[PDB]
């Protein structure tokens, strides 16, 4: 399966996950790992930190329009290359 960069997928079965649910919630939050909980009937789930979920949906939202995706790519490439505008602004 596919996994975000810097993340690792952990596989656990259901009895285990329900016994150790709090420990798994800490694990995915602390180490940005994700847990596939397996079911005898293959009705499995993936558990991720709320932060990683929000990150994935935010990344999706920004990248999903090819024109916005290109605007972000070019702008981050500009910033890394010093191709920038520096302005003092007041709040």
């Amino acid at each position: 399966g596919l996994v975000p960069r810097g993340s690792h997928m952990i596989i656990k079965n259901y009895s285990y996950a329900r016994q150790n649910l709090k420990a798994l919630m800490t694990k995915v939050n602390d180490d940005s790992d994700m847990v596939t909980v397996t079911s005898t009937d293959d009705k499995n789930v993936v558990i991720m930190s709320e932060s990683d979920y929000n990150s994935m949906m935010e990344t999706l939202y920004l990248q999903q329009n090819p024109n916005n995706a290109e605007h972000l790519a070019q702008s981050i490439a500009d910033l890394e290359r010093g191709k920038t505008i520096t302005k003092d602004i007041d709040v």
Binding site: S55, E58, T59, N68, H71, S75, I76, D88
Partner: protein
């Protein structure tokens, strides 16, 4: 008041657009920038989130339901990649 900000070319054009035509939006962006300055990249208003994929290293904050402030922080200096959604 004064806050030194590094824009990308296109982010700056959009910032300047908002300046002339949408002062509601420039005010929000400026408040987000102040919050990043004071609180750090991941704390404060706008629901800060880390971005993934090729946006790794950058963050998002909400200007409104539609537009995002996409930015990063380098040696305590804020860099803006985007402040308006491009279609």
């Amino acid at each position: 008041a004064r806050l030194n900000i590094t824009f990308s070319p296109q982010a700056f054009e959009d910032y300047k657009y908002f300046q002339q035509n949408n002062k509601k939006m420039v005010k929000k962006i400026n408040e987000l920038l102040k919050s990043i300055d004071r609180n750090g990249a991941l704390e404060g208003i706008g629901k800060p989130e880390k971005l993934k994929s090729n946006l790794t290293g950058y963050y998002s904050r909400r200007i409104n339901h539609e537009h995002r402030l996409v930015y990063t922080v380098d040696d305590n200096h804020i860099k803006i990649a985007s402040c308006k959604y491009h279609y």
